Design a protein around this nucleic acid. Sequence first.
RNA 1: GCUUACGACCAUAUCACGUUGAAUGCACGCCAUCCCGUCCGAUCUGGCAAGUUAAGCAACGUUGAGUCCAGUUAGUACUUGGAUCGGAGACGGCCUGGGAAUCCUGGAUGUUGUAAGCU
RNA 2: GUGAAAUCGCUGGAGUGGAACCGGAGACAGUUGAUUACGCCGACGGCGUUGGCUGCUCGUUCUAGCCCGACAGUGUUGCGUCUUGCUGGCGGUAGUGGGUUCGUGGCGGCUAGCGUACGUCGGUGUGAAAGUCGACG
RNA 3: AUGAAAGUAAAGGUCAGUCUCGAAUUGGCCGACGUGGGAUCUGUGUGUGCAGCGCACCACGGCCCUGUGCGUGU
RNA 4: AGAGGAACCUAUUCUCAAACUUUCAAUGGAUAUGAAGUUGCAGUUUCUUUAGUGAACUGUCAACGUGAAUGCGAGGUCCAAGUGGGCCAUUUUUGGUAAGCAGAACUGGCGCUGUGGGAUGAACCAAACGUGGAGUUAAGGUGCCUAACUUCUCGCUCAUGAGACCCCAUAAAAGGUGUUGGUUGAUAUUGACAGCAAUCAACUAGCCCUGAAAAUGGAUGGCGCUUAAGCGAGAGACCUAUACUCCGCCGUUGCGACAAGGUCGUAACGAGUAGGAAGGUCGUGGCGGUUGCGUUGAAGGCUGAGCGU
Lengths: 61, 160, 179, 187, 52
Amino acid sequence: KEGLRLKREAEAKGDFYVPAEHKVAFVVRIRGINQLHPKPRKALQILRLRQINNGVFVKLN
Amino acid sequence: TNSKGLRRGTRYMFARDFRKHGVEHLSTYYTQYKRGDLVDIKTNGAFQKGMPFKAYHGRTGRIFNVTRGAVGIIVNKRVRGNILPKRINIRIEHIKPSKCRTDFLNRVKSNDEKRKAAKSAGQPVPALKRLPVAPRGAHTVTTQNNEPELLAPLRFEIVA
Amino acid sequence: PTKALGETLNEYVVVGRKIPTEKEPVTPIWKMQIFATNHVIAKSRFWYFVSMLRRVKKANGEILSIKQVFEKNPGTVKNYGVWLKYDSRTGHHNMYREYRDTTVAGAVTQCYRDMGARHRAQADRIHILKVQTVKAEDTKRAGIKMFHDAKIRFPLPHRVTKRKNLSVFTTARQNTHFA
Amino acid sequence: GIDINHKHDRVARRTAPKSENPYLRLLSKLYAFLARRTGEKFNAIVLKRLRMSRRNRQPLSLAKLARAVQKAGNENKTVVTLSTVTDDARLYTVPKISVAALHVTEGARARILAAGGEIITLDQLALKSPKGENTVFLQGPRSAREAEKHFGPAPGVPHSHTKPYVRSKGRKFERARGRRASRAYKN
Amino acid sequence: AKSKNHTNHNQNKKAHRNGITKPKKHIFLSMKGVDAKFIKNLRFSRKNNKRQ
RNA sequence: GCUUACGACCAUAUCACGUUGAAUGCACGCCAUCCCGUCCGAUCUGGCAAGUUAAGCAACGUUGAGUCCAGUUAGUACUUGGAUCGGAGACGGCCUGGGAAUCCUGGAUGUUGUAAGCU
RNA sequence: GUGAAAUCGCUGGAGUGGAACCGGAGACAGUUGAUUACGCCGACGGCGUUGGCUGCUCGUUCUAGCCCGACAGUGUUGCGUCUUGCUGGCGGUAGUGGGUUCGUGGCGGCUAGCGUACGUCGGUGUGAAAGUCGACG
RNA sequence: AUGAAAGUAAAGGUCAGUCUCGAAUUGGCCGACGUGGGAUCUGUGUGUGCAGCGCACCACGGCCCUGUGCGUGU
RNA sequence: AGAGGAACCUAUUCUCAAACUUUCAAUGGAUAUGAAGUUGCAGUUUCUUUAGUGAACUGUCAACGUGAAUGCGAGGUCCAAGUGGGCCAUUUUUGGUAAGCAGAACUGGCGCUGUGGGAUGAACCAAACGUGGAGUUAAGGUGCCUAACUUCUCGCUCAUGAGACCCCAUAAAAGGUGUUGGUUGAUAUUGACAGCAAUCAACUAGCCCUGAAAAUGGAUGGCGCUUAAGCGAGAGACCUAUACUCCGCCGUUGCGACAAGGUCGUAACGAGUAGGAAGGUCGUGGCGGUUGCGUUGAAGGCUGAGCGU
């Protein structure tokens, strides 16, 4: 409700209310486990995405 | 195959910088080095004694010995699947203090001081942790005297 | 590469600006009209064009707003002129094209399909410089102008009708002429 | 498919003594029960050392037992060892020692009993201290073997003091080239 | 029948298979290779400090 | 506002031409018995104080050359990763992120430490 | 003494279009089992689990059109700063009112595999034997 | 154990003295060295903490035997 | 290559460098990010200083209390096999006119490896494998071969064998008044060109055409396809892996329960040449012992009902 109210209030006077950038994300691995470079491979392992259709929550920063 | 002399391929690595040849300034010799300090290695071509090997140029090491005009440094070197802590005796001219450790020491000093001040003054213990830069927060942008400017792609012009 | 996927591309108005810094506490606000399949593509294309025009990229900039634009009156027919720039296999060209549609988004979708049909040009090689509504007397393409007649009339000469939900074989006689 | 490594999935372990000694197997059974039920790491240690191989149970010395008991507070504690307790000829005075062990040599047993001590077995320790209370756990020196002297950096490597495998000892047996600067070099 | 054929093809993979082992942490404790005069004075200093 | 001795950074400090320079000082300067060194008291060395800011040196001046900083060049050149992307190929663009350097334009022309002294 | 395999002849059955053999899945031939409750099988319902297809209904976001007012234009009917149409932005929204978006939404319909909170029932089998049923094949 | 060999051959820690203040000497106590880490054990608070004794083992040192270079004397 | 004062001087100018450079990225390399730390107090030194002046060390000294993200158990020793002909690909790159040629760099593969697709193929695209089932898909496809539409929308193309999908299985310089779009400059209702109401000219780029010749008869895979079953932009649905989700069973690994060299539970997992280990109430022949069968038929031989992966 507050987000919508602020947005509409800014629109009324012709300003721009910029909402806060998202802080959480969902990541899903969609590619297989073969023919992968070392750097993306280790990054996926660190994110715990070691299989197709594996999903995790990630704190965006 | 290549020859295996000490100074193979160091044509530019061991050269002086443009308009920086000549007499070596004396702060190099006035700097203080103590065992346990971290130093960057950057060969100075003007001094041919106590020169580090080209493999160690641009690496950081920890001092383990301090002689009259040189220091012993422990520098990590990768050899196949192990990292060897090699020991090298380098003269002061090829050495420079490393600021990375001093910054951390300053941060530790600041943390201890802040904790002590908070505890003495009865304040709650402060947050003394570095945190990654978080996504930007919500804010309002005003268009007063800043009206949006409508942009369009530009046509192709034959710039002969 | 960017593709004009989707029936009837959508239209978005994207407003953004370079993130203020100490030397520039207030920065100009830029606005663009984008035609894309969805708002993610709209934002990406906005940054593409804004980075082409001004020294700013997505990293140093931010999006103040992005809002879909809907045709005011989709119950009226209009003539749309499209100024575009595109890349051929050999060089760069500017084109002006005309379409008749009830929506500007529909006209731009027609433009993309027509460019693909007649010049084998993909969406990644087309820039829509401008789209506007032109008056009937201001059109300059025969295909469009031929429909600016109040007494327009024509039959459907050779109509081949497809049977939909019934057997392949029939004894019926097929007729292609309907007077 | 999942991106994992199976190289270290299996860990070699002993779930029972390799020995066919029925009494050793029974002791392993008893202390497996004790470790599982009491849940004491002391019992777990005793179980592991019961299942260990004789290489890892090197003989202990009566002198080491005496030193352990002569420490402040260890006078009335029970010394627990799964190594053989041997007699030391260099030890002149034997204090009162209470020891639970697998095997005690004749001389060590005689001296311990003469000095007023007591020797019990591991089954008797299970009854005296089911949780291992008032114990002093000891073992022999594991690295004090002749074989261990031959382990380490190769003999012909700088700063290496590894014992070589020589047929005999003398001036004619690997003492000339690479061992003295008079012949080529010395490491 | 040429048989020199040097290459570094499969060497990083072999090196990384068992990980790249970093040096230990006690390596900085040893006083090996330090100035002999400093070492002598350190021995004298340590041989005399009264325990209590 | 200055002078000297010793410096640190080592042209924003260099270079060219010119103006001015209170007081201390620096400097030029006079002499060559002695110490000392030379073909030569030119340099170096020693003993001095008649004379001079002429030069050195300092400050300042110049739409000055150089040096330094910034803008522009330019989100350009180049480039990480992606495509059963376009093209006969050479190559090219798109997606995802990094991102320069000349020409040209504008500005600045040493900062500062210890000791002693002038004002 | 026993008397294997390869190779070979006869009798009966069956296949037989420029190879033959072979794995998977059925069918046929054939072989084999079969004590009210219980076995061996099927069908229809219920429940659990994983589903597949398919409708209504509320709301949310961003937005209109219809309708009203003036202005500008014109692919314009009828008889010219005419009229009727039609379009464009702009200003209104009372009423009416669709698109778009999705919900820690609400109510349905059809139906599959696997298992058995479990029910309602059928085929068969309790000497032979025949038949029938079941499984292999 | 060590040296080619003649051969020689593995006890110090601490406290106090005398002193010709040294490359001296004496006497007690303890006796297989010191420190850090150490499963377990012990005590004591509240799964956890602190404290003590510390096995094996590791790290850093100290002494002792032998060969050898330097170098003294009593 | 000129210019201003034949050469010379001055300020310029066109084009360049693997063994030229003022300047200088992207990728890249290295180190640090606390308890093995920070503050003091209070001792040792024969080193160092004019000097407690420093440097270092020591203490059962005192206090403080874990100082980026994410993931995760870590470390040690010993014994030993096979290998020491490689090859391919994106990118960079040397020799060579080139090569399915020779030589290198990073990474990923094949070798050692099956599976869906590319008609076929060691390496290409998708995806890696216990044994079964249901559902959903990746790459690829849906006129018939062939499971899935002669499905829906807009164009372009007629070729006297058109074209038809990564690697990939060749095509260029140069041309066309074939047709379709665009760019620019003109003339035209004060009536444009042709003949006694739009037109002219030059360009440009899509498809098509010419350039385009080889030997057994032959290849978009084949048949065939022409508002396509071709070329380009798109939309619904649909088909299909040993992949993903769920369900059963076998085993391995980790952990756990139980008075057991055993049973059971639970979660995840299962590719494999050379090679290494483990289990084998798998099999064979002796010996020391033990358990039994046999002229009412042993060994051996031929072959139905079963058991075990």
